[PDB]
Design a protein around this ligand. Structure first.
Ligand code: ADP
Ligand code: MG
Lengths: 188, 188
């Protein structure tokens, strides 16, 4: 349907938004636990409710991003808007840029936010990414993520120094989402 | 043998009859190309996220041939590749987005498993660079589809080349993409 019309998207092709939580197979634990969580989230969702999102991590091509698109489609089926952001592209358009701040605002404020592909390529990110996360915590705005790295690795990954604050941001994330590993074949 | 898998666009197919053995590692720049190549083929898998080669050097060296070689070793192992003579496409593009199919050609090149763009530079324009070219690179970055290049110029010279400030930034976001996609190897 016009489901896709309610699903906003930044820096990523809209054709990947052709997804459904019914096309995902039961094959293993990762997804069984994931969509089970997803559907409970989508059923119980209501503006302004402490609610944990998902932090999906795993190898390349297991269907992590598709899971987010899938969840967004379920929500648009509830007439709730969400936004999926290819994050690596968000941090880049931020270095080379007319307008962008009006959009960070939209990101911090959307009902449900899905940050795709966290973790690939101190730092100014202490001013941009953290605040976003902190605003969604403060306002009870559900937040999802997809990374190739898990909680342990992601920290070790963003901008290594010779600090702790990277670990402070790692805290907002696990506060915001419940991590689940997605195993399975390499769909490609 | 392995030629029905690797195809081309805008260049007589008799140029793609190559081999990594038909070459002689004469002077070093070349040594790391062949090495990069074998590494690439051995560790290649869809969605992987792996650099390609950006080979730069003066006229009559072997940039094109090398690509064809890598393209052949890749066929020896199943993988289909696609090498396109860039200057032709851009030239062609000038007037062709007019009602029709060639753009479904642009669509296929954007989505192929391995893209090899022969001799970038050596002419061309801006809505094409930044609207035709750019999106190609941005898509293949997001999907982690291997991309190779060959240019008479080193990265720093291909940028100052494309400038014809604000287009300073444009050559910037576009050069950033090439770099993120290919590791530069000088040849002589
Ligand atoms: N559950 C699924 N049902 C049908 N297609 C799927 C499913 N999951 C992933 N895909 C397909 O696989 C591809 C995406 O895998 P991807 O979302 O990129 O994994 P990452 O999200 O890389 O783990 C898409 O092009 C999509 O067509
Ligand atoms: Mg992904």
């Amino acid at each position: 349907k016009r489901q896709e019309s309610l699903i906003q998207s930044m820096f990523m092709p809209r054709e990947i938004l052709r997804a459904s939580l019914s096309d995902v197979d039961l094959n293993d634990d990762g997804r069984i636990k994931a969509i089970r969580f997803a559907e409970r989230f989508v059923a119980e969702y209501e503006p302004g409710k402490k609610m944990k999102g998902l932090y999906l991590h795993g190898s390349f091509g297991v269907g992590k991003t598709y899971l987010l698109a899938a969840i967004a489609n379920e929500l648009a089926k509830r007439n709730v808007s969400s936004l999926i952001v290819y994050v690596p592209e968000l941090f880049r358009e931020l270095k080379h840029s007319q307008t962008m701040n009006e959009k960070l605002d939209y990101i911090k404020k959307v009902p449900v936010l899905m940050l795709d592909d966290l973790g690939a390529e101190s730092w100014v990110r202490d001013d941009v990414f953290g605040p976003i996360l902190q605003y969604r915590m403060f306002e009870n705005l559900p937040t999802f993520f997809t990374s190739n790295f898990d909680m342990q690795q992601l920290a070790h990954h963003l901008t290594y120094s010779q600090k702790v604050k990277a670990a402070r941001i790692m805290e907002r994330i696990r506060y915001l989402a419940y991590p689940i590993e997605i195993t399975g074949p390499n769909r490609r």
